[PDB]
Amino acid sequence: IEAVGKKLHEYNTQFQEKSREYDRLYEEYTRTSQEIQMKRTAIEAFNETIKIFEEQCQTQERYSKEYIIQRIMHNYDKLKSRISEIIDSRRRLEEDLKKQAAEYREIDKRMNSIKPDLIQLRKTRDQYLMWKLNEWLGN
Amino acid sequence: SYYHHHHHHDYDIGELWGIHLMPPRILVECLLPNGMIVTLECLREATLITIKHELFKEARKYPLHQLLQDESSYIFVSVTQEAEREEFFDETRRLCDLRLFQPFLKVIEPVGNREEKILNREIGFAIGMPVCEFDMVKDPEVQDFRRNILNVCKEAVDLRDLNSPHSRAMYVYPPNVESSPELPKHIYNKLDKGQIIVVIWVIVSPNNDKQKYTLKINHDCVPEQVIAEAIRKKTRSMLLSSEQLKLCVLEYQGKYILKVCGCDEYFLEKYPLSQYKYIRSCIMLGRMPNLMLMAKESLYSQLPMDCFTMPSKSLWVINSALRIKILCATYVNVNIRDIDKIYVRTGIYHGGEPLCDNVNTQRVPCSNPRWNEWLNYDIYIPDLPRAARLCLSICSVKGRKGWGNINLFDYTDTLVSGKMALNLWPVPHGLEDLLNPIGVTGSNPNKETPCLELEFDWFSSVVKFPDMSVIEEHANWSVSREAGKEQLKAISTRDPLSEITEQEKDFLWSHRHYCVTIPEILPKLLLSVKWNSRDEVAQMYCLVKDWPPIKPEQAMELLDCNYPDPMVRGFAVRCLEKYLTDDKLSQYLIQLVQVLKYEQYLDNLLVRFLLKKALTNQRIGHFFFWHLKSEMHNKTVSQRFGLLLESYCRACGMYLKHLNRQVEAMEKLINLTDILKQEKKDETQKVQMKFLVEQMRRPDFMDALQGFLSPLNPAHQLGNLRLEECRIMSSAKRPLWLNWENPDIMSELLFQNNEIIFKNGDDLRQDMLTLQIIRIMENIWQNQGLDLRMLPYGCLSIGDCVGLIEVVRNSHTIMQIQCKGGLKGALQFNSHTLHQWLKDKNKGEIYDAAIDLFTRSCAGYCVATFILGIGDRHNSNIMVKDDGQLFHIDFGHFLDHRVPFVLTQDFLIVISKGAQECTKTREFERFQEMCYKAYLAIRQHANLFINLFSMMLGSGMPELQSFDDIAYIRKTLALDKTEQEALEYFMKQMNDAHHGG
């Protein structure tokens, strides 16, 4: 070794400290995407469900009103009280979602920032290749 | 598969959103038409007919009940977690089985009064997507496809009814046959009485009794001849004159047909007996075939169905150089450091690159990105080939120093013009190196992420042009401006990724007309065209029109990403229609499915080919369904495949019902294995198995997992679960070892108790491909007469990283063999009892045959494994059967990143015990010969494997992106070298790894 010595080897194990951090940052990235789409189809599920519970308390309108013992009662009191728990369930889902988006965009950011750096340290190894034969690779 | 590749030596001649598993008791909110919500406490395994009867028992408590109708006048409906509303007609259905989201049911009367029309939209279930998410796509291509495809469906259904009973029987139960009638001469000699002994059975129940009748008959003796000779035997009597006999073995010859005992095969087609795969396997394996006489009545009785319904200006004559307006992407992700930027790189593409493509002015490296540019690409408009594509991406590197694609033409032939919004795909995984045309990305709005807005040139109503105008490019070749050995059909014999010189492209194009004589050069010729000249291309279209046909092996190359042209592909498809047989079709069915990804438009020639066979040959239908369903989670292909699946399901017939059993069954498995893998069920084997068995005992499981067919081979019925024999193979992601009684009339009787691993974890796809390639090699070998014996066990991917693997009985890893027997501190490799292990099992003249098997198989793998550069083999990759045979499992990691199977001393000893080394024994000499013949044989058929791999580029598989990955296999098989040249190379690699040539 003459000019820049075996200093190009400490550059290689360090190279993996990000080459693998890519892989690990990527699966986190890939995972989180489905995670989101799960949440997103969940909300439509919520929607049509919410949508259904109105169609019910509005059935016992002109159908229950056609009399007004009288205590055909506590049913309606709670049919509202459940709707509350659903709208707030969906509400909770919603905020969990855009956080995961803000997360998704973050995971995207740091990946579209390593990539070029990871690639700029790729060929510095490959160019200076000529600098038993083969021994430097192992460790 | 039939036996367990076991030779007989010297025989001679329940859910809810968020929750995995609903409590054994939940409260379900029932909702009635009177407005009153009741809350019923249901057992999770209860039928809807039981919950309904309850609801209407509880109704008389709840006022306004005077408004409630007859029980048998209503239907339950709810929101499923696929976010849909579903009328629950099949009230047999268990609570836990109706995918459910929130624990509620809502009563209503059967609206849509076509009960039977909505039933059938089951299908979404088999598809894994509601058949109504289609009933809503704007894209007319889609709506057209669904409509225009049913021709094939109508065609197929006809081609089955035409011939009334037999035809169906033959649709279902296709004959399972090798595609050569000629029988290898190393098989013929295991025969060498010239012929074979079979045992044909007759059941005479309710006397239960089964009677054998052993015949020693011709190997090529068709099944009708076998039924005859069998009825001769049974009926021969001291009371029948031979004349009287002959008119009986007649007046009931053909009331019967043949059936493999124990599974569901049926020889129903005039073929040499030995051309059926069952018989040929019985030979190789040293087994006496057992077949059954089945009354046609009792076959033809089994088969119902026959049900099918279906409830639904100018030209290239333009004088301007193509421009495309790039507006604005609305989203990105990063915020500046130094030499970082953003710009929309654009290209015009036909497979790979016409025209010097264009990166548009780099402006604002972050803040809301406008470009408002026009992009002049340096080709004419009339020069654009049908299927030319806009390729774009955004990514940047280091400007100073240190993604989406679009069909330029509609499926309509119309040139694309005006406003377009293009949601972009997240960049792949081993990609920024490019701009990415390979991308399925062809025709591709996504969902809500980065979105480019576009503007295409506009000049009054534009389309492509009937082959009328096209053919009329005779004009060009009648241009003779004569002011200016042929030994080059060597380069037909040249692997597809050989990469050819511009100098050669010119040459081939020059002598283009002198290839309609050497037709197999077509691929190379097609590569030679400058595709950005409407002139060369239109001439091409015309050669192609009446080009001579080509072998499906070669004719497949024209279906990969490199040949994206309706005219090229049509010929290709017409080669496959011409002579690619149901046998070899299901060998290459994976690739043929994958290729569909680069097919530009939904409606097209290849799909219609495939769909039709799949609808004709139920054995193909099965894997066609499964290979497509497997990838429905992948949104780049979902819509295409979903749509393909719907047509298929709507026409396959009774089979649909079978497939759902299959699908319900796999749903249960995927949910169970999940619990164990996740839901903090990282407790202990003992606890887990507790759970495993409690769960499979519940009647929902019992029902789902018992009367179905093996997705690995539907001939194999799967009856009742052995249960005692079921275990979490734990020792991984938690794979399940499952055990089913084989409900066959001659079940244990005559051949098996059925076994299979379900694994929820690994991506099975690569394994799947490599097992496929092993089979293919094994086929090259057997035909060429050069007998080596691989064991490509079953392996089916059924969804995202989920699948079934075939169990092979009486087989062990070398490690197992090593632990079974021995004390000491050293290993000894049980070099003894891995040979002594083989001396036992195989005592006697059996031994020689077992050493042979080992030797064969060992050599087989040794090559296959080097060629494909797989895993890297140790003692828990390598498996031996009592039988003698060696075989590799868990290949895993594909095409390398050299010499994965290093022959340890253990294996050398097995090639009969030699003292100080066994590097030079005549047993080992014999062996080396085989390898050199094996490698040299696969060498001879290299282009095939290049293709197979190449056709397989459209698939996630991190192991296969680029053609340069297939390069490895190009190296390993010898790059430029001669046969006798490369033979040397292989040896150099044998010696380098072994330390002893």
Side-chain angles (χ1 to χ4, degrees):
Chain A
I1 2 150
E2 291 158 313
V4 193
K6 282 199 176 191
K7 229 288 160 194
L8 222 77
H9 176 75
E10 299 181 359
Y11 135 112
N12 190 77
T13 322
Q14 284 172 352
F15 184 91
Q16 263 56 68
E17 202 169 358
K18 43 227 160 215
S19 178
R20 172 268 172 106
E21 200 183 286
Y22 175 86
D23 300 13
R24 263 219 153 201
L25 219 144
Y26 197 59
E27 191 60 76
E28 224 265 26
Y29 178 95
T30 303
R31 174 183 154 272
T32 320
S33 193
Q34 296 167 224
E35 201 93 355
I36 280 165
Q37 221 67 198
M38 278 184 72
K39 292 168 170 69
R40 196 165 284 163
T41 24
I43 291 163
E44 288 153 288
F46 264 123
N47 300 343
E48 237 74 19
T49 298
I50 290 148
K51 187 174 275 184
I52 272 159
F53 276 110
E54 334 272 63
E55 296 178 324
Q56 182 74 354
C57 56
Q58 293 187 99
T59 319
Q60 59 163 256
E61 291 313 276
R62 345 159 206 96
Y63 276 51
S64 80
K65 203 204 183 295
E66 268 165 23
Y67 310 90
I68 188 166
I69 334 161
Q70 51 268 325
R71 320 123 75 188
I72 332 300
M73 186 189 62
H74 200 102
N75 192 246
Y76 169 94
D77 299 40
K78 143 262 325 311
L79 175 40
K80 295 170 295 183
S81 201
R82 178 77 174 100
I83 292 173
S84 285
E85 279 199 328
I86 320 184
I87 303 190
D88 292 305
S89 286
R90 178 180 59 88
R91 198 199 182 190
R92 251 171 281 108
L93 203 53
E94 268 144 19
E95 34 213 50
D96 293 332
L97 174 70
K98 224 65 202 158
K99 199 75 169 178
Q100 262 243 325
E103 185 70 76
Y104 188 55
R105 296 190 302 256
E106 192 74 302
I107 316 291
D108 204 21
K109 166 199 255 294
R110 300 279 261 202
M111 246 216 42
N112 284 134
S113 197
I114 292 166
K115 206 179 215 81
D117 200 306
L118 164 65
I119 280 157
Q120 281 170 108
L121 317 161
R122 271 277 160 193
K123 276 73 215 173
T124 319
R125 163 274 332 252
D126 198 29
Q127 294 138 192
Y128 281 96
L129 193 76
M130 256 235 75
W131 217 288
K132 57 254 271 187
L133 291 155
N134 250 16
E135 186 185 293
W136 214 13
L137 273 87
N139 299 296
Chain B
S1 50
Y2 288 118
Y3 305 105
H4 279 266
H5 283 271
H6 179 72
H7 314 234
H8 286 354
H9 284 319
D10 288 24
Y11 163 103
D12 257 275
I13 253 330
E15 256 225 346
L16 207 54
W17 149 251
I19 279 76
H20 275 302
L21 187 126
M22 45 170 59
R25 272 178 324 139
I26 35 169
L27 317 165
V28 293
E29 295 159 310
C30 290
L31 287 75
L32 296 159
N34 51 55
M36 314 229 88
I37 161 195
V38 286
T39 319
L40 228 50
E41 171 216 349
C42 300
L43 260 135
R44 78 140 202 156
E45 325 95 8
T47 66
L48 293 149
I49 103 130
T50 53
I51 294 157
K52 202 161 95 163
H53 175 66
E54 270 269 88
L55 197 50
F56 283 71
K57 216 194 178 205
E58 284 279 315
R60 213 183 313 191
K61 297 178 199 288
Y62 280 79
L64 259 41
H65 73 281
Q66 42 273 177
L67 312 179
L68 285 162
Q69 270 261 341
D70 274 310
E71 183 185 342
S72 62
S73 294
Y74 290 123
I75 270 307
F76 290 113
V77 183
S78 181
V79 179
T80 64
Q81 32 204 111
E82 217 154 2
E84 74 157 344
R85 285 147 100 114
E86 171 171 9
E87 293 177 347
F88 297 126
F89 330 96
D90 185 18
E91 310 224 290
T92 327
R93 289 184 76 211
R94 292 175 140 90
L95 187 61
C96 60
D97 292 343
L98 333 159
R99 288 78 84 265
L100 256 206
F101 177 79
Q102 215 87 328
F104 87 86
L105 296 183
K106 180 203 218 311
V107 183
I108 25 164
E109 171 136 331
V111 199
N113 225 157
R114 254 172 224 172
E115 199 89 336
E116 275 129 73
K117 209 272 278 270
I118 347 177
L119 292 187
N120 196 18
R121 284 138 208 250
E122 270 160 333
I123 281 179
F125 185 85
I127 286 177
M129 140 165 16
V131 155
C132 67
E133 264 177 32
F134 297 135
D135 280 310
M136 237 182 184
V137 187
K138 313 165 209 157
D139 196 346
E141 186 167 359
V142 172
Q143 246 47 67
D144 268 333
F145 183 90
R146 305 180 68 198
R147 280 192 301 249
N148 295 315
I149 204 70
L150 323 165
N151 345 287
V152 196
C153 305
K154 267 221 176 179
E155 281 166 46
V157 178
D158 277 359
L159 232 188
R160 283 139 51 181
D161 166 50
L162 275 64
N163 208 160
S164 30
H166 176 247
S167 251
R168 307 162 94 196
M170 184 96 318
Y171 157 58
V172 195
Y173 320 128
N176 188 35
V177 126
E178 296 245 353
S179 93
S180 185
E182 312 289 282
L183 173 76
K185 309 161 194 180
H186 78 262
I187 305 181
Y188 191 81
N189 292 4
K190 284 219 176 185
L191 265 180
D192 225 316
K193 289 274 200 179
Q195 72 217 65
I196 167 191
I197 296 178
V198 205
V199 179
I200 167 156
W201 291 75
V202 169
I203 267 282
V204 208
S205 61
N207 269 315
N208 75 262
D209 201 65
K210 22 77 198 177
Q211 273 178 120
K212 54 191 156 200
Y213 300 90
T214 328
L215 327 185
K216 176 157 169 168
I217 207 72
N218 275 356
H219 87 244
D220 37 32
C221 177
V222 307
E224 208 152 13
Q225 287 183 299
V226 184
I227 301 178
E229 212 56 39
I231 285 156
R232 293 184 205 281
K233 267 213 163 193
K234 181 177 201 204
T235 285
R236 285 192 150 103
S237 170
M238 144 197 154
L239 295 175
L240 281 222
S241 73
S242 104
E243 188 186 81
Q244 284 302 14
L245 185 270
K246 202 214 152 171
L247 337 169
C248 284
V249 198
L250 205 93
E251 192 67 315
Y252 69 43
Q253 270 243 21
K255 319 211 165 180
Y256 292 91
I257 357 196
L258 280 176
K259 163 173 196 302
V260 186
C261 304
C263 74
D264 270 332
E265 273 182 55
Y266 296 78
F267 320 81
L268 310 182
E269 239 278 290
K270 286 90 189 151
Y271 273 94
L273 208 252
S274 57
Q275 197 170 172
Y276 284 90
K277 297 183 183 298
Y278 172 67
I279 274 73
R280 227 177 268 207
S281 148
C282 277
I283 309 182
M284 301 286 65
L285 274 161
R287 303 263 190 149
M288 210 161 49
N290 307 21
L291 312 176
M292 171 154 73
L293 284 196
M294 178 142 209
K296 281 178 175 164
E297 260 206 341
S298 56
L299 205 197
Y300 296 153
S301 178
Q302 284 178 16
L303 311 180
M305 86 180 86
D306 306 298
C307 302
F308 181 71
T309 321
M310 51 224 282
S312 285
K313 230 279 134 200
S314 94
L315 210 99
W316 72 4
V317 64
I318 263 92
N319 210 335
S320 78
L322 173 77
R323 6 161 272 164
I324 300 162
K325 178 144 208 162
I326 308 294
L327 271 91
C328 52
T330 47
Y331 271 139
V332 79
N333 62 43
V334 274
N335 187 273
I336 311 165
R337 190 55 224 173
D338 55 3
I339 330 143
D340 53 3
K341 41 158 79 168
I342 48 150
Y343 51 106
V344 180
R345 170 146 226 197
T346 51
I348 272 75
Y349 270 80
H350 174 107
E353 71 180 79
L355 155 163
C356 317
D357 69 33
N358 191 1
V359 279
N360 76 342
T361 307
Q362 308 84 13
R363 282 281 183 181
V364 74
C366 190
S367 308
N368 296 271
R370 275 225 153 279
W371 273 279
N372 227 44
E373 275 180 81
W374 276 96
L375 293 184
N376 305 279
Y377 303 93
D378 95 303
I379 65 167
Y380 259 83
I381 283 289
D383 273 330
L384 280 170
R386 176 137 205 16
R389 279 148 54 246
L390 170 52
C391 285
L392 57 80
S393 65
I394 292 165
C395 299
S396 64
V397 186
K398 290 292 150 191
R400 201 261 157 158
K401 67 182 198 198
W403 136 74
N405 297 346
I406 267 181
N407 294 344
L408 292 190
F409 280 109
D410 269 38
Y411 74 106
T412 261
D413 302 349
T414 273
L415 190 269
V416 182
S417 79
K419 164 218 278 181
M420 250 206 104
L422 204 75
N423 286 232
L424 301 189
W425 306 93
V427 274
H429 339 272
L431 268 179
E432 205 243 341
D433 188 78
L434 270 75
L435 160 73
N436 200 353
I438 311 170
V440 20
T441 306
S443 180
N444 65 342
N446 266 59
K447 285 324 176 75
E448 60 148 340
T449 40
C451 174
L452 264 308
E453 277 168 332
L454 303 178
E455 218 244 71
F456 287 81
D457 269 297
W458 165 250
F459 12 69
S460 311
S461 74
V462 207
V463 88
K464 257 214 146 221
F465 33 103
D467 262 76
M468 304 158 198
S469 158
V470 191
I471 285 170
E472 285 195 35
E473 289 317 73
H474 317 291
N476 304 315
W477 53 49
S478 78
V479 164
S480 329
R481 258 316 86 161
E482 298 137 320
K485 228 280 195 203
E486 137 276 308
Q487 290 191 220
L488 286 316
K489 282 70 204 147
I491 68 187
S492 325
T493 321
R494 210 160 155 210
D495 67 274
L497 85 160
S498 204
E499 222 95 292
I500 48 176
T501 63
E502 264 75 300
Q503 310 128 243
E504 280 172 296
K505 284 175 184 175
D506 269 324
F507 173 87
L508 320 188
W509 180 254
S510 301
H511 290 70
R512 57 189 177 272
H513 289 269
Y514 310 96
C515 311
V516 184
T517 47
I518 309 124
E520 68 260 337
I521 78 100
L522 187 65
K524 305 289 197 312
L525 171 71
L526 286 158
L527 283 156
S528 328
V529 179
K530 213 204 173 188
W531 286 91
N532 49 13
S533 97
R534 84 193 139 266
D535 281 1
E536 292 182 285
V537 177
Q539 287 175 39
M540 189 51 86
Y541 275 38
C542 265
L543 294 163
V544 172
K545 191 178 157 214
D546 27 39
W547 189 261
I550 273 186
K551 171 198 192 190
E553 192 226 64
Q554 351 254 63
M556 264 182 171
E557 198 195 340
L558 306 170
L559 295 191
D560 73 8
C561 56
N562 287 170
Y563 303 84
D565 182 276
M567 231 49 60
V568 177
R569 302 194 154 244
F571 170 67
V573 178
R574 268 141 30 215
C575 295
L576 273 22
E577 319 210 62
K578 167 70 169 173
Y579 37 53
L580 180 271
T581 33
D582 296 17
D583 174 52
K584 255 92 40 277
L585 177 59
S586 12
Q587 211 160 300
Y588 320 125
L589 180 72
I590 331 177
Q591 283 81 8
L592 290 166
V593 154
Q594 288 311 287
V595 135
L596 264 163
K597 291 152 168 194
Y598 345 95
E599 204 76 319
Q600 262 214 339
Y601 313 124
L602 303 188
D603 198 334
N604 72 261
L605 292 170
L606 177 58
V607 214
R608 282 156 171 287
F609 176 55
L610 292 168
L611 180 79
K612 202 170 175 181
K613 311 232 88 178
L615 273 159
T616 282
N617 178 327
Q618 205 172 264
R619 194 221 320 297
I620 299 173
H622 172 90
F623 292 95
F624 176 75
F625 168 90
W626 277 109
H627 292 328
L628 293 165
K629 218 289 171 71
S630 160
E631 288 199 317
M632 278 302 308
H633 62 279
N634 180 130
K635 300 95 144 183
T636 95
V637 285
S638 328
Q639 190 197 49
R640 171 171 261 162
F641 288 10
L643 230 17
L644 225 192
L645 277 155
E646 179 196 21
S647 44
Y648 171 82
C649 288
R650 210 170 273 286
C652 64
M654 260 332 92
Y655 198 45
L656 180 72
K657 203 28 232 141
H658 296 129
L659 280 169
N660 283 285
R661 285 200 284 271
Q662 236 146 120
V663 154
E664 302 171 51
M666 305 303 281
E667 282 318 294
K668 286 256 173 269
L669 261 31
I670 316 203
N671 188 242
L672 210 190
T673 50
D674 275 344
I675 297 153
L676 316 166
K677 275 202 93 163
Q678 287 198 308
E679 194 155 286
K680 288 248 220 148
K681 275 277 207 296
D682 317 316
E683 313 216 44
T684 56
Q685 263 276 8
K686 211 175 205 155
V687 183
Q688 265 167 302
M689 289 283 296
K690 261 288 131 291
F691 182 71
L692 187 70
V693 198
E694 298 217 333
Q695 211 58 250
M696 303 172 75
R697 254 153 209 185
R698 308 236 220 172
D700 61 299
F701 260 83
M702 279 278 87
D703 284 19
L705 282 153
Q706 272 179 161
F708 73 100
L709 315 176
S710 168
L712 274 185
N713 177 161
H716 302 233
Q717 297 193 288
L718 304 164
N720 307 267
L721 277 154
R722 286 261 173 189
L723 222 68
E724 290 229 270
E725 279 297 287
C726 284
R727 54 195 98 96
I728 304 170
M729 268 304 75
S730 217
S731 298
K733 25 265 153 164
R734 313 293 305 223
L736 297 182
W737 178 287
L738 298 173
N739 197 297
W740 331 77
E741 301 194 297
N742 158 194
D744 204 279
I745 325 76
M746 304 172 85
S747 140
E748 284 334 317
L749 214 184
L750 295 195
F751 97 175
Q752 72 193 60
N753 217 63
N754 229 302
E755 257 162 348
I756 171 179
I757 303 161
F758 174 94
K759 203 208 296 152
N760 177 358
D762 300 324
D763 181 3
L764 270 328
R765 283 168 322 175
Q766 316 92 268
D767 276 329
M768 195 159 135
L769 176 52
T770 135
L771 295 152
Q772 188 200 11
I773 306 226
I774 275 159
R775 217 156 340 212
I776 273 111
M777 292 183 172
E778 174 149 76
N779 272 342
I780 279 103
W781 294 333
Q782 250 54 34
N783 171 99
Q784 282 202 2
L786 118 87
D787 179 310
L788 314 148
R789 270 171 268 161
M790 315 300 279
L791 208 167
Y793 45 86
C795 186
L796 182 80
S797 175
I798 78 128
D800 177 14
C801 271
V802 194
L804 308 172
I805 309 79
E806 189 188 318
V807 161
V808 6
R809 231 167 147 274
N810 314 297
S811 70
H812 320 263
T813 38
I814 318 280
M815 184 196 291
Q816 266 184 308
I817 269 104
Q818 290 192 178
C819 298
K820 172 243 151 273
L823 34 64
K824 213 175 184 282
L827 11 64
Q828 214 269 133
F829 301 101
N830 277 62
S831 303
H832 194 248
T833 314
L834 190 274
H835 180 208
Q836 197 64 240
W837 185 92
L838 265 152
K839 284 159 183 165
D840 169 23
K841 322 275 172 176
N842 318 81
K843 346 209 176 208
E845 196 191 334
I846 281 153
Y847 174 91
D848 270 20
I851 294 290
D852 175 276
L853 199 43
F854 189 101
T855 303
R856 258 95 217 274
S857 54
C858 208
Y861 278 88
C862 221
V863 170
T865 196
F866 170 68
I867 295 190
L868 298 161
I870 316 170
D872 214 47
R873 310 285 71 193
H874 33 252
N875 283 2
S876 16
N877 295 162
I878 295 156
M879 287 208 136
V880 194
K881 305 189 279 86
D882 308 345
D883 176 79
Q885 192 158 27
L886 181 139
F887 81 97
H888 298 332
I889 87 267
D890 204 357
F891 308 96
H893 228 302
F894 213 66
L895 257 170
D896 191 83
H897 308 268
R898 182 187 256 82
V899 65
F901 186 35
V902 157
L903 300 160
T904 75
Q905 277 65 18
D906 312 14
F907 309 104
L908 300 173
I909 291 154
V910 176
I911 324 180
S912 293
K913 180 142 81 149
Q916 234 196 42
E917 340 256 352
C918 17
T919 313
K920 190 148 273 191
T921 62
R922 306 221 152 193
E923 314 274 288
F924 191 83
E925 286 193 298
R926 144 180 163 266
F927 166 90
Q928 293 197 275
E929 205 282 351
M930 309 200 85
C931 290
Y932 302 147
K933 289 286 182 75
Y935 171 101
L936 197 137
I938 301 311
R939 197 224 160 62
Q940 196 208 337
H941 308 248
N943 59 310
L944 203 224
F945 300 99
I946 311 279
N947 300 329
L948 285 175
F949 272 106
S950 310
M951 320 205 347
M952 206 66 190
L953 231 28
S955 22
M957 291 203 308
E959 301 83 19
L960 271 179
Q961 340 245 61
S962 93
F963 279 80
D964 60 54
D965 284 357
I966 325 171
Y968 189 115
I969 141 105
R970 204 206 136 256
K971 164 196 285 182
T972 293
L973 277 168
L975 303 86
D976 81 294
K977 316 104 136 74
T978 334
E979 330 87 5
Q980 53 172 0
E981 275 254 309
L983 228 189
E984 257 98 51
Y985 167 75
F986 174 69
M987 278 194 75
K988 285 203 275 81
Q989 294 313 296
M990 186 216 184
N991 204 349
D992 279 346
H994 283 90
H995 303 240

